[PDB]
């Protein structure tokens, strides 16, 4: 016999002040009892269990569906907390195409690791007796038990640790871990491809562990998690949009599932009115009517996922590149590629919960979620194309009150283009007409009124029924912009709207909000001043708008 | 060469934190530095047993092209039991130049407790979640943890007793992995007398405090004032009144009766140039009952004045200013906010660290998403302090302009 060479042990521990399991089992039947019994022989012959005595006091339900399983629900409870088997999904954009790829079956090798020998007493677990009139038989685990919580973990560690001197020594080629399953990619030839998998089912074996001389079941197309993977290309998997009379919640968010899921390959999927329609539901069975603009949305995602369409590979020896375009409703999109025409992938990004909101710092939040990804997926940030010019950023960024940023980027011609809707000056205009804005409303009766005097002798008051005092202060500042010349300066002492303003918003939530942005888009030139309250400034009149 | 006990605060476990995405080029520098470090005994790898976390990434000190491995022990420090301590030297600050020295080198010959490495955790990731990350542990005293600093004092001061005993001019305070020596000779010696340190240190950044005050709130000077100029000195003024109680603006309001242009010269009457004669003098006196209190947090607003000028405030209550300043150097930032931004925490948490010894908490004026993204791009410091973001415009802004 070859000496095996011994797998490591990993030091397993309960969790603080806990104790091992002491579950009662269940009673099975007669021909349940006779097929564990078989199945638990032939494990004790092959060295996976061993029985125990009586002293162990710890026991684990055990079940057969024979095929024996194992409930270690409790012990899972008891067990200490393992580092994650993973960190997150690979993603295929971020695979580096090779001329073969072969996938290597080491599934016996998870009951070949061996259990640390001080948490294998945790594991007991007893097969009833016929009748009850003997003594259960008593087993342990000797390796990795299917369940337990750190299998995966452990398995993992073992395995990587197992392959890492071959993958030193050999790095021609790409080892990855999946599961029970190796994944073995190189640019060689295939003679030497095969020649290197033989290589590494010898260095495997090295340590008693078994692969398959069959041919692996696995075969492109390559489907995993919703995915298709082939030689050359990838996709997901084909996603059918249901052709459904009346739509419930549940079919609203398999819909939305399936075009988030599509959403990554095929361009320009839209989900704003299909999930706006679950806005605060709460009830899976609950049929929602369906508005027109969901109709138009669902239609022409109908259209977008007409054809397949698929994303290639990264290329690291090419440019990585992102473009991004504004869709409405605080929706974009984009699209990571390295040539034309052939995505890596795609994706969408929606603005987040606001009261107000412009389409820069929109496009802002863009860029950093797709800088992420991109960190993530390929490990460098691509080169953006975005539709705003680069006076506009300047001149954005230069006069914005927070620090921004956005890493190297070019302008791309592509409508709708991001601008910048006003601008308001620095100085007072000199010429134009002064507006002493005020606004005031009663707490309990909810009147209120609004309204200006100017320099030029013009005024005017508004009375206003169930409003509050910074919707009449805006709704002062509305009346002096409906009511003045191209270039107006206007005074206020509410911090409220002045706080609003300069956040310089395009769309809001309040309709008054918008408004007063479609009176500072017309406008030429558009001074605001503001002053603090009740400190006897003239001009600034809150005794005029509280009659 | 020998462990001192080390635990945690009672009930606490240890950190379990996220590692955040790294770009290639970090991930590559983080693989060659903690090889070089395994091979030196100071990091060894560790088995999936081990679930606590920290993060880690690389940078690029000043002057050097030699990438560094910086860990967030944010969270690690705050969980680490406080250790025990010395009264922070008082003239630090009042010294007219102090001298910043990177002695983390040093840490790592003292061996770290055993219990406790399990606690020093931290991954390099992998690019595209291939592999969980390569997980390392310490061995040795960790550059960046509190307890380091705490544990290797008493070495520290044995190595320093010679040269602390030859200039007893020479203020030395330590924070972290950095030593900060504070004198008043020239710069030439200064810097003779550092190269000394350094050698007198081997065998075992000019900050000029004194050229630093605190600035007070200045008024226009003015012969002819517009409606709108009288208009943000009352403003100003009203604001003021908040920090200083015998503010007075009325006479000054009295002149903005009637709805004028903005444009419009108006005149002071004399009511007026003795209210804001008054108003100077006011403001030409310190704040009443400012004191600090080491049981409370630092707080630093930071307000964004353009063109590459920045104020900020340190307070620990409202209108109670310790320390207020302007940082409007230009280095290599011309075009980049956020990297302006991070040079400029880092220089207010180093005054902080000169004056009382610990960092603030810093007030940020940008967006959660495109700093938790780019900050690490610019950070030079091996520490790091803690921040939140502002989300409104404050309307001070320009009352600190
Ligand atoms: C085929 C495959 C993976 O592919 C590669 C494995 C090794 C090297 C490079 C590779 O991709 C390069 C691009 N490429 C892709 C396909 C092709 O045919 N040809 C190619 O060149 C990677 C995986 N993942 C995400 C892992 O984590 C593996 F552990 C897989 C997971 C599950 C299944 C199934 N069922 C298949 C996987």
Not at chain 1, 136 to 161: C, D, E
Not at chain 1, 249 to 259: E, F, H
Not at chain 1, 476 to 489: F, K, M, P, R
Not at chain 2, 101 to 106: F, I, K, Q, R, S
Request: glycine share 6%; charged share 25%.
């Amino acid at each position: 016999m070859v000496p095996i060479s011994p797998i490591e042990t990993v030091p397993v521990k309960l969790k603080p002040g806990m104790d091992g399991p002491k579950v009662k089992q269940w009673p099975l039947t007669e021909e349940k009892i006779k097929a564990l019994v078989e199945i638990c022989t032939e494990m004790e012959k092959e060295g996976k269990i061993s029985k125990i005595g009586p002293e162990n006091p710890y026991n684990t339900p055990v079940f057969a569906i024979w095929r024996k399983l194992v409930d270690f629900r409790e012990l899972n409870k008891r067990t200490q907390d393992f580092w994650e088997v993973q960190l997150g999904i690979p993603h295929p954009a971020g695979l580096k195409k090779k001329k073969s790829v072969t996938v290597l079956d080491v599934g016996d090798a998870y009951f070949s690791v061996p259990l640390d020998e001080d948490f294998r007493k945790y594991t007991a677990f007893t097969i009833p007796s016929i009748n009850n009139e003997t003594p259960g038989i008593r087993y342990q685990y000797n390796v990795l038990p299917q369940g337990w919580k750190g299998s995966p973990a452990i398995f993992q560690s073992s395995m990587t640790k197992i392959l890492e001197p071959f993958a030193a020594q050999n790095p021609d080629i790409v080892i990855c871990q999946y599961m029970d399953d190796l994944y073995v990619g190189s640019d060689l030839e295939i003679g030497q491809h095969r020649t290197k998998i033989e290589e590494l089912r010898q260095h495997l074996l090295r340590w008693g562990l078994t692969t398959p001389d069959k041919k692996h079941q696995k075969e492109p197309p390559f489907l995993w998690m919703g995915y298709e993977l082939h030689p050359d290309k990838w996709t997901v998997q084909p996603i059918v949009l249901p052709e459904k009379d009346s739509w419930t919640v549940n079919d609203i968010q398999k819909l939305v599932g399936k075009l988030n899921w599509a959403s990554q390959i095929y361009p320009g999927i839209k989900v704003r009115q299909l999930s706006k329609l679950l806005r605060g539901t709460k009830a899976l069975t609950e049929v929602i009517p369906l508005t027109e603009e969901a109709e138009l949305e669902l239609a022409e995602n109908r259209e977008i996922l007409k054809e397949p369409v698929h994303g290639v590979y990264y290329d690291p020896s090419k440019d990585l590149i992102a473009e991004i375009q504004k869709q409405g409703q605080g929706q974009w999109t984009y699209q990571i590629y390295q040539e034309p025409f052939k995505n890596l992938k795609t994706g969408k990004y929606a603005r987040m919960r606001g009261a107000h909101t412009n389409d820069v710092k929109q496009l802002t939040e863009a860029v950093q979620k797709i800088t992420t990804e991109s960190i993530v997926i390929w490990g460098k940030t691509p080169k953006f194309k975005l539709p705003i010019q680069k006076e506009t950023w300047e001149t954005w960024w230069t006069e914005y009150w927070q620090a921004t940023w956005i890493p190297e980027w070019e302008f791309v011609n592509t409508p709708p283009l991001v601008k910048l809707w006003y601008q308001l000056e620095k100085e007072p205009i000199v010429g134009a007409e002064t507006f002493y804005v005020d606004g005031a409303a009663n707490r309990e009766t909810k009147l209120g009124k609004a309204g200006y005097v100017t320099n030029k002798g013009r005024q005017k008051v508004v009375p206003l029924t169930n409003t509050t005092n910074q919707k009449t202060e805006l709704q002062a500042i509305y009346l002096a912009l409906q009511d003045s010349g191209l270039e107006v300066n206007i005074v206020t002492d509410s911090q409220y709207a002045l706080g609003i303003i300069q956040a310089q918003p395009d769309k809001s939530e309040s309709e008054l909000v918008n408004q007063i942005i479609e009176q500072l888009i017309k406008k030429e030139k558009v001074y605001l001043a503001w002053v603090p309250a009740h400190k006897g400034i003239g001009g600034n009149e809150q005794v005029d708008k509280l009659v | 060469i020998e462990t001192v006990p080390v635990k945690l605060k009672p009930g606490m476990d240890g950190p379990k934190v996220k590692q955040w995405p790294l770009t290639e080029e970090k991930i590559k520098a983080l693989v060659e530095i903690c090889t070089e470090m395994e091979k030196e005994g100071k990091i060894s790898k560790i088995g999936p047993e081990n679930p606590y976390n920290t993060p880690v990434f690389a940078i690029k000190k000043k002057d050097s092209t030699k990438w560094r491995k910086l860990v967030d022990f944010r969270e690690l420090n705050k969980r680490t039991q406080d250790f025990w301590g010395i009264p922070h030297p008082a003239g630090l600050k009042k010294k007219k130049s102090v001298t910043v020295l990177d002695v983390g080198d040093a840490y790592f010959s003292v061996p770290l407790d055993e219990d406790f490495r399990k606690y020093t955790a931290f991954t390099i990731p992998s690019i595209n979640n291939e592999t969980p990350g390569i997980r390392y542990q310490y061995n040795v005293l960790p550059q960046g943890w509190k307890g380091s600093p705490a544990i290797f004092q008493s070495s520290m001061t044995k190595i320093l007793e010679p040269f602390k005993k030859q200039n007893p001019d020479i203020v030395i305070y330590q924070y972290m992995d950095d030593l900060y020596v504070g004198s008043d000779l020239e710069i030439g010696q200064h810097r003779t007398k550092i190269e000394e340190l350094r050698q007198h240190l081997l065998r075992w950044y000019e900050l000029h405090p004194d050229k630093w005050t605190v600035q007070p709130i200045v008024l226009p000077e003015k012969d002819s004032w517009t409606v709108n100029d009288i208009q943000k000195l009352v403003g100003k003024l009203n604001w003021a009144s908040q920090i200083y109680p015998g503010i007075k603006v009325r006479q000054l309001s009295k002149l903005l009766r009637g709805t004028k242009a903005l444009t419009e010269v108006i005149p002071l009457t004399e009511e007026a140039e003795l209210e804001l004669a008054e108003n100077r003098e006011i403001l030409k006196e310190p704040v009443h009952g400012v004191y600090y209190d080491p049981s409370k947090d630092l707080i630093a607003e930071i307000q964004k004045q353009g063109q590459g000028q920045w104020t900020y405030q340190i307070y620990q209550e409202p209108f109670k200013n310790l320390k207020t300043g302007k940082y409007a150097r230009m280095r290599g930032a011309h075009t980049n906010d956020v990297k302006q931004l991070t040079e400029a925490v880092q220089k207010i948490t180093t005054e902080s660290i000169v004056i009382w010894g610990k960092t603030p908490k810093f007030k940020l004026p940008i967006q959660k998403e495109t700093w938790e993204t780019w900050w690490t791009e610019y950070w030079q410091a091996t520490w790091i302090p803690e921040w939140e973001f502002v989300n409104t415009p404050p309307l001070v802004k320009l009352w600190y302009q």
